[PDB]
Design a protein around this ligand. Structure first.
Ligand SMILES: CCCCCCCCCCCC(=O)N[C@H]1CCOC1=O
Ligand SMILES: CCCCCCCCCCCC(=O)N[C@H]1CCOC1=O
Lengths: 454, 455
């Protein structure tokens, strides 16, 4: 039985001021490097234990001993995401109901149905970049957000955000991003009631109204038209939980649409932005990926089967998720009194945080070269030990969108690498913006067309 | 027989100048023409011009033995950034005939076949934009038509993509161009242009000119350095030799031609397409006849050059839209010698005339009492039209060089719109005409219902 280390304290505020930074996850990664596989993090009224080793995280991922916790971050996100899939407790009736109704919409098989709509948005991205003039550059995260938001809008709800027809952000996306940012900002407030935050709270309620108004209109419009689109909204309006036999109520459907739009856009746009970052910084890897895209994507429009043949592109995406998993932590609570790793006694209800980027740098799993971008680590996926690679979380509370995201990102990155050569014309210095999700900020490139027609 | 011509209301020392203190000066001059008739004197401090509205007088003004193109006060202000380009040059300037001879073959059928592919590129972007609207959404007609015609001339002019359909706010170059045009038209009403109140306007104007020159001169220098040959006007202008002088255009004149063409595409063809769609949704029998022609002729996903030339009724629709709202609403002439207009109005050498095209096109002695009705069938027998009765492209050797270009673009685009969509005047839109250099509907919105025909 060992005492776990704890980072520097600030008297009565304990560790809370360590979160007073626009990059809290990167701060916690540096703390993990200094303190090791486990450390105590205390704020007034809460304790959590940050885990960084596969040795301890494999135990935390035992669903008989630990269940998903709503971290302080998710409790704040629940103010707009309600009891949607992401911000519901496993024991809430609406978690299992929504999970059972929506799971078949998100299988590898279901991806065949979404494919044509993913291509629609991917072709818009390629056409945008083909139409740039000499000496113009690409704003990578901005264009990846346009792509991932439009893809989930169209595939999920048959709704066109038409993000590529706008050079200033969609009003809905302004509110979504600011709502997420307010959730992260609430984490570091020593005094949440300080009048300095009154404007932030008024803006938060305005942003919630913007999101609700659009979503509730989409639900009402679909109900009024009677249209069957075989999209997520169709499945949610018509679907019945096999267990309870109940449908979702209109309120829960609204929270699911908000949840899908936010998670769908934020995480996947981060992945594509990090993937392109690593490719232009590792030109040997860019060349391997570009050769595969050129050899496999022989048709103007990729087919579903051709996307499944982009093996190296898939390894590139997994290696980007290893280094910068875009939803970089998940929280667990102990179901009963238990001992973690034969050394750390826990009481029923005790919180754990899995620090995914640190897990993914565990030298006992990956070897000494853990900072290197080497997609070949994933060439034999079976070689990866249990619970060593967790970019989609764990068990029944794992990402429902995993197949969706990886199909979209593989298709899009394949088309990008088929159609363009890329130049890191600014020698971009990685700047990772945190809004609970991670994405490169200020990342620009030049694309030179290979002049291959669509 | 010699008559004194009427004159609208005066403002003491300012004479008629305050009549132009409006954002709708052409519409103001049309109402003056309705009241005073075929000719009126318009005086400002230090200038006089005579506004003509009847075919009887305009047919005389179009006599090239007696009258030549004049730079109206408007064109003199535009010449600060359009220089001695084709539009703002005098007929007798060496660079007018030289540029005219070099550029005429850039509007040959062979050149038009090359421009067609680039027009289709932009037209498909417009159709895709409208196909991608959600059910609750409307089209901003003049906004989308301007996006289309600017992008078309940018691609056809110098192989440059404004990417107007990727933007809510204009390209920085277009912000400067539009503000430069606005400054030119605003200078028309200024009693004292030297008032220090206008120092800011003048500073902004010089900044806007630098923005336009810097972009255009860079594109010309880049093209010369690369040696790349495209299907664009810039290639024709870098390679062309005037058969008369044997000289090519110099890089400065090429820049003025590019600015001239970009202003033309942004301003004129977008107006025509917006007015044409206005008249179609207000006249559903005409919309149906045009849509039946589009459906019969445009049988391929991408229209061909030859298919567009078969859209005869769509062409009549565009001519009838130009009759009622000619988007370039005036041209100016000066007397080459002392002469008498219409056997009644003595003119001295140098005297200025303004042709008020929208009034000409409402001459009931030519068109009949149904003159306000939208009837494309008026253009079934064009030989019936008296001399100089229909002048939307101006007159003689100074007539629009882009006439074929603009009518091909507008026919292609209107044809594709009518093939792909049904239109609804969902607001019962009341025509409101915004004036810049040109006339365009303002606030015109419609809903499109897709006929779901693939591209
Ligand atoms: C509507 C669904 C929400 C979609 C995005 C949610 C991503 C949540 C990841 C939360 C990770 C997380 O808890 N981060 C905390 C830990 C302390 O500092 C932080 O920032
Ligand atoms: C370089 C310009 C290219 C194409 C522009 C064509 C439009 C030119 C028309 C100029 C009309 C014009 O001179 N209008 C005056 C008449 C009195 O008040 C006005 O507004």
């Amino acid at each position: 039985i060992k005492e776990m280390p704890q980072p520097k304290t600030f008297g009565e505020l304990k560790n809370l001021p360590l979160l007073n930074t626009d990059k809290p996850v990167q701060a916690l990664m540096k703390i993990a490097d200094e303190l090791g596989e486990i450390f105590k993090f205390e704020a007034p009224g809460r304790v959590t234990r940050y885990l960084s080793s596969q040795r301890l995280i494999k135990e935390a991922c035992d669903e008989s001993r630990f269940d998903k916790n709503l971290s302080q971050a998710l409790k704040f996100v629940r103010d707009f995401a309600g009891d949607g899939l992401f911000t519901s407790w496993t024991h809430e009736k609406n978690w299992k109901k929504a999970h059972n109704i929506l799971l078949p919409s998100f299988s590898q098989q279901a991806m065949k149905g979404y494919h044509a709509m993913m291509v629609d948005i991917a072709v818009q991205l390629v056409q945008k970049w083909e139409r740039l003039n000499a000496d113009e550059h690409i704003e990578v995260p901005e264009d990846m957000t346009r792509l991932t938001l439009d893809t989930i809008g169209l595939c999920g709800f048959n709704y066109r955000f038409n993000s590529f027809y706008r050079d200033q952000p969609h009003p809905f996306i302004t509110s979504m991003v600011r709502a997420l940012d307010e959730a992260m900002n609430k984490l570091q407030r020593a005094n949440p009631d300080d009048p300095a935050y009154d404007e932030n709270k008024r803006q938060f309620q305005e942003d919630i109204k913007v999101m609700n108004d659009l979503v509730d209109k989409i639900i009402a419009d679909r109900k009024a038209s009677g249209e069957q689109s075989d999209d997520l909204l169709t499945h949610m309006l018509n679907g019945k939980d096999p267990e309870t036999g109940e449908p979702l109520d209109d309120e829960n459907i609204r929270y699911q649409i908000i949840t899908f739009l936010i998670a769908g856009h934020e995480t996947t746009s981060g992945l594509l932005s990090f993937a392109l970052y690593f490719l232009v910084k590792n030109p040997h890897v860019l060349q391997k990926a570009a050769e595969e895209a050129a050899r496999v994507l022989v048709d103007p429009v990729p087919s579903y089967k051709q996307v499944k043949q982009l093996k190296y592109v898939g390894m590139v995406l997994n290696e980007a998720l290893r280094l910068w998993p875009t939803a970089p932590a998940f929280s667990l609570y102990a179901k009963e009194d238990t001992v973690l790793g034969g050394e750390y006694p826990l009481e029923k209800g005790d919180e754990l945080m899995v620090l995914i980027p640190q897990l993914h740098r565990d030298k006992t799993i990956w070897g000494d070269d853990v900072e290197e971008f080497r997609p070949e680590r994933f060439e034999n996926p079976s070689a990866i030990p249990q619970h060593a690679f967790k970019p989609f979380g764990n068990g029944q509370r794992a990402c429902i969108g995993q197949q969706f995201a990886l199909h979209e990102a593989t298709l899009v990155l394949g088309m990008m690498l088929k159609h363009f050569d890329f130049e890191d014309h600014t020698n971009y210095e990685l700047d990772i913006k945190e809004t609970l999700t991670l994405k490169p900020e200020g990342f620009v490139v030049k694309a030179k067309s290979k002049k291959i027609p669509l």
